[PDB]
């Protein structure tokens, strides 16, 4: 019961199942295409603080995947490495054949800890995590992915690092990592470009920790 789009010299139509269109010729299987599109193209927020609120954990439901033949370049991809407070892993290792998404502009790598209630992390809106040419219902550990959806039809990076605490819950906190001992408090009003600009002025000017302590920066509210 999965719909197919049909591309005409008019517009994009959705193929029926009850109505047979005699002129909708299919000459080969090469005219059928699976396309992975990103959610960012619909205006969903992409900052880390808001993104992680769309994900959550559950048990009793197995993971599954489907393939793509083509897809979009992502401006914002994510890569998670989350551990439980006791040091154990939250996310499963990716299985053979799963590789990261090939075309990301900024990768938001989040490392940290938090409660992990289930077996797997699932998307709450039912969107898929997009891996190289495979969409998945779950997040795999250490693998870069984009969020998105898959269409079927008839045809005729800069790496930004963050630390996280309380990753799997509602009230969580994040830091932007400049150096091993240098961090900036993260806010939802920051864009990837903003963070890169802060990394250049702080690092270049030497406003970094010299002692063994952690230097934590807070952006002026204005």
């Amino acid at each position, epitope marked *: 019961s999965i719909p197919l789009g049909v591309i005409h010299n008019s517009t994009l139509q959705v193929s029926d199942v009850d109505k047979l269109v005699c002129r909708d010729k299919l000459s080969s299987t090469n005219q059928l295409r699976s396309v992975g599109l990103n959610l960012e193209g619909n205006g969903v927020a992409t900052d880390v603080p808001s993104v992680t609120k769309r994900w959550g954990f559950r048990s009793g439901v197995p993971p599954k995947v489907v393939n793509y033949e083509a897809g979009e370049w992502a401006e914002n991809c994510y890569n998670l490495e989350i551990k439980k407070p006791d040091g154990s892993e939250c996310l499963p290792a990716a299985p053979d054949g799963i590789r990261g998404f090939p075309r990301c502009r900024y990768v938001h790598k989040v490392s940290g800890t938090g409660p992990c209630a289930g077996d797997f992390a699932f998307h709450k809106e039912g969107a898929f995590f997009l891996y190289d040419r495979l969409a998945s219902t779950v997040i795999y550990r250490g693998t870069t992915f984009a969020e998105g959806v898959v269409a079927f039809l008839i045809l005729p990076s800069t790496t930004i690092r963050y630390q996280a605490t309380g990753f799997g819950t509602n009230e969580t906190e994040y830091l932007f990592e400049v150096d091993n001992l240098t961090y900036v408090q993260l806010e939802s009003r920051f864009t990837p470009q903003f963070l890169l600009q802060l990394n250049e002025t702080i690092y270049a000017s030497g406003k970094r920790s010299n002692t063994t302590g952690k230097l*934590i920066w807070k952006v002026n509210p204005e």
Partner: antibody
Amino acid sequence: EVQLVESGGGLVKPGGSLRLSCTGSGGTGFTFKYAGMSWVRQAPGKGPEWIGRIKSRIDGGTTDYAAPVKDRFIVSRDDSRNTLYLQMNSLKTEDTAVYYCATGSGKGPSASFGESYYYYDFINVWGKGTTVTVSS
Amino acid sequence: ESVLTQSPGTLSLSPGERATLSCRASQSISRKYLAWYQQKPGQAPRLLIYGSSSRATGIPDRFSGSGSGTDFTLTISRLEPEDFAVYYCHQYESSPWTFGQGTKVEI
């Protein structure tokens, strides 16, 4: 700029227990983006003794204890209330001491960008010390 | 464990004279993990020096630490009347913390 002040002391009988507290201000909150906090005690006539310290949540939130208090004292924090606590069980009269809270903090360099603080693995800020007396 | 022992137990020097106090650790330790503290009755100890050789702020230049391995020293180039305090060593050990026993400095 950081200050922390101890309370919850006074006279307790041996074989009992008590919980000390230390509430501060001048920092950026003591739970996240902050130094962990320790307890140190000093009996009159004696030097300081490390009890243990609670790490910040960004550093895991665990407690590292000194051997002399293992399995008797617990170091914990009231998150976002900027308050450090010490639960001392199985009290003996040997535990009479002044109990101090201590913090690896203080303000760092500023920039046109924003403000900053440093969180250390040593102590810059000491509280006043609350005397705990354990006696019959 | 890694334990700090101070020597001499008491230092005796007129103000204006140089003073040194050493600590010997039972275990070798890197410089970045050492500190000394200054205590007077009624006060919590002041930091003075940390990281073996890095001065704490609010501390005069006459106070300077040095050392490596198991042997560390605090040197006061000229000991002033206001500096005749009890001094302690401290080490971080990358996890457990240790304090020295307390050494008295007298005129």
